[PDB]
Amino acid sequence: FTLPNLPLSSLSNSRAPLPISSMGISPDNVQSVQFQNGRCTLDGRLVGTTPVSLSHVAKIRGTSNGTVINLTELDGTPFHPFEGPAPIGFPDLGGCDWHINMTQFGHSSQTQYDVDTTPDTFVPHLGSIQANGIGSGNYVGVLSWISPPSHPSGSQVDLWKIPNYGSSITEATHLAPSVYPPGFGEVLVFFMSKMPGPGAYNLPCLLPQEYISHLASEQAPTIGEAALLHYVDPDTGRNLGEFKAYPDGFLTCVPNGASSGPQQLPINGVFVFVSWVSRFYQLKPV
Amino acid sequence: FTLPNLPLSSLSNSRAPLPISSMGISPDNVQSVQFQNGRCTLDGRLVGTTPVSLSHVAKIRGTSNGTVINLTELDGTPFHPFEGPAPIGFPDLGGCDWHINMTQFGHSSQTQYDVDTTPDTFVPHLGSIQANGIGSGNYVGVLSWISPPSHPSGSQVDLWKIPNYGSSITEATHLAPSVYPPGFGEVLVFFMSKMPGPGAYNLPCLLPQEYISHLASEQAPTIGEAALLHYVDPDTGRNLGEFKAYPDGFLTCVPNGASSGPQQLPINGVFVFVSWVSRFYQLKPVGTV
Ligand SMILES: [Ca+2]
Numbered sequence: 228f229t230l231p232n233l234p235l236s237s238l239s240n241s242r243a244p245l246p247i248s249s250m251g252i253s254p255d256n257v258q259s260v261q262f263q264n265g266r267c268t269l270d271g272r273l274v275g276t277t278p279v280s281l282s283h284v285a286k287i288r289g290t291s292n293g294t295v296i297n298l299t300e301l302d303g304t305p306f307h308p309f310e311g312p313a314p315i316g317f318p319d320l321g322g323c324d325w326h327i328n329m330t331q332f333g334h335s336s337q338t339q340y341d342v343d344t345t346p347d348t349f350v351p352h353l354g355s356i357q358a359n360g361i362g363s364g365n366y367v368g369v370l371s372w373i374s375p376p377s378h379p380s381g382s383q384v385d386l387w388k389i390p391n392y393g394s395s396i397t398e399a400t401h402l403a404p405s406v407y408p409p410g411f412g413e414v415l416v417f418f419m420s421k422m423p424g425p426g427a428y429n430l431p432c433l434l435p436q437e438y439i440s441h442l443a444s445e446q447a448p449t450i451g452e453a454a455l456l457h458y459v460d461p462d463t464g465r466n467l468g469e470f471k472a473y474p475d476g477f478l479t480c481v482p483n484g485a486s487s488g489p490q491q492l493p494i495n496g497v498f499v500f501v502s503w504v505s506r507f508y509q510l511k512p513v
Numbered sequence: 514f515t516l517p518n519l520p521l522s523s524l525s526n527s528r529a530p531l532p533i534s535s536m537g538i539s540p541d542n543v544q545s546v547q548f549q550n551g552r553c554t555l556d557g558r559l560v561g562t563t564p565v566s567l568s569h570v571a572k573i574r575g576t577s578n579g580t581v582i583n584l585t586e587l588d589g590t591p592f593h594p595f596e597g598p599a600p601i602g603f604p605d606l607g608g609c610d611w612h613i614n615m616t617q618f619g620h621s622s623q624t625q626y627d628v629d630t631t632p633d634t635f636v637p638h639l640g641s642i643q644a645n646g647i648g649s650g651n652y653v654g655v656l657s658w659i660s661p662p663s664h665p666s667g668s669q670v671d672l673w674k675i676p677n678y679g680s681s682i683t684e685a686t687h688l689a690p691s692v693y694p695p696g697f698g699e700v701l702v703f704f705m706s707k708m709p710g711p712g713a714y715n716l717p718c719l720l721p722q723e724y725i726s727h728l729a730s731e732q733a734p735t736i737g738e739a740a741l742l743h744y745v746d747p748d749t750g751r752n753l754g755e756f757k758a759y760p761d762g763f764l765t766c767v768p769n770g771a772s773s774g775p776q777q778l779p780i781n782g783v784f785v786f787v788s789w790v791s792r793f794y795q796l797k798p799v800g801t802v
């Protein structure tokens with residue numbers, strides 16, 4: 228079994244096309260997460276709206292009639308509700324307004340599309356989102372920058388969230404399931420990127436995008452209960468700490484206190500597969 | 514030795530963050546190319562301005578003073594002329610004007626930056642390009658759409674070119690070397706994408722970006738003279754054509770006449786390494802035997 232032999236700081240977020248700038252843990256008011264992009268199992272099964280390639284990540288495609296944008300897949304193929312919560316690659320950033328840069332094949336210019344994901348017109352699961360002033364035509368859009376949610380008024384930017392893909396929060400949209408910390412002092416490890424916009428925004432994901440294409444390619448036939456990893460300095464070969472990767476596609480570690488965890492590690496290290504271990508294998512704290 | 518076990522249509526161009534839509538050959542007024550992005554050897558050596566990750570591709574970072582933009586690497590690290598023709602990831606699309614979407618950490622809004630790459634103020638090799646109206650501040654920019662070049666006036670978009678990175682076409686900028694068709698009836702194979710803007714623009718590259726991260730990770734210790742590959746349909750397992758990958762990081766095939774080449778192949782196939790062969794190994798024309 229292998230992970231990419233590439234330093235983390237050379238890789239991309241899997242929730243937006245942004246370089247990885249650090250590792251992190253979630254705030255204390257965040258336990259589980261339910262990201263729809265950046266989801267890939269260790270045997271290579273893509274989950275949620277996750278694409279193989281960053282060229283599809285945090286993008287939309289569709290035709291505006293001036294009132295709504297009717298969505299398709301990025302290549303123009305129809306999207307149907309049975310397929311998922313939104314087309315492949317659709318942004319999954321809850322807890323913010325989006326600003327998507329819209330361009331066209333065969334026309335000049337770009338246009339900023341401002342997206343509040345809270346109203347009942349925002350129903351990408353049914354292939355329809357409000358045009359919010361975007362004129363008639365076919366567009367490809369990519370997330371450019373974010374800002375605080377328009378509703379509820381005065382809400383914080385909270386990128387641990389996903390948007391409401393359905394007409395209401397009660398509508399089933401075929402979300403990929405939530406990921407939970409597995410217990411025994413282990414915390415989920417997130418790969419962070421700086422996101423432009425009027426604040427110090429940091430976007431977490433479960434796996435760098437290049438890990439997803441690697442795992443989707445490798446299609447490992449021999450996944451065990453947990454992969455014991457070392458986070459290694461490439462030059463010195465020094466083991467900077469023990470981590471576990473779980474079959475559902477996430478990493479954990481045991482921090483060495485609130486002041487010393489994966490966020491204190493250099494970001495130019497490489498994760499290296501050591502061996503398959505028990506689900507309950509007890510890690511040495513970072 | 515391995516290449517990604519992923520269909521081409523799931524992958525990205527390495528000169529802009531765009532899905533791969535086809536394979537193609539060069540125009541008959543292009544024999545060699547000298548792309549600076551999308552360059553990686555089979556043993557994993559990145560060449561030119563090529564980054565590992567698509568998150569750096571066709572991007573700029575720098576500080577405008579209202580007159581010029583002083584460039585750095587995307588992470589803010591200094592860039593110096595000895596390092597290359599431009600910072601890592603900098604766009605390499607010749608034969609067009611660029612329209613780059615500029616955003617800022619800690620600020621609202623985006624701004625379109627319009628770039629004619631022809632004037633003597635466009636000197637990314639020396640870390641400086643004209644601001645062309647972009648206000649003071651630090652920005653990250655990503656290529657968004659392109660249009661015909663402002664100079665020479667009336668010329669067509671030609672993405673087979675690279676821009677002039679120096680103050681003059683005679684200035685040495687440490688460009689990655691040209692790639693030439695190798696002989697034996699073989700043609701260079703390009704991976705194509707559609708680029709937004711006011712025309713039917715076709716962006717070629719030598720390798721999908723995911724192949725570059727794959728090769729850079731793999732760091733193959735045993736590269737031969739050429740890799741013999743099959744282009745395979747995953748479901749049926751059918752061999753749709755023999756190709757060669759050369760150490761410098763490019764693929765070739767032998768077209769089955771003017772009528773039948775890479776452009777006629779479906780784009781949902783997978784390249785699979787077969788064996789190391791001699792540089793002079795003669796391929797069967799695509800689709801034949
Ligand atoms: Ca698995």
Ligand SMILES: [Ca+2]
Nearest residue numbers: 631632635677
């Ligand atoms: Ca110039």
Ligand SMILES: [Mg+2]
Nearest residue numbers: 231233497498
């Ligand atoms: Mg790694």
Ligand SMILES: [Mg+2]
Nearest residue numbers: 517519783784
């Ligand atoms: Mg392939």
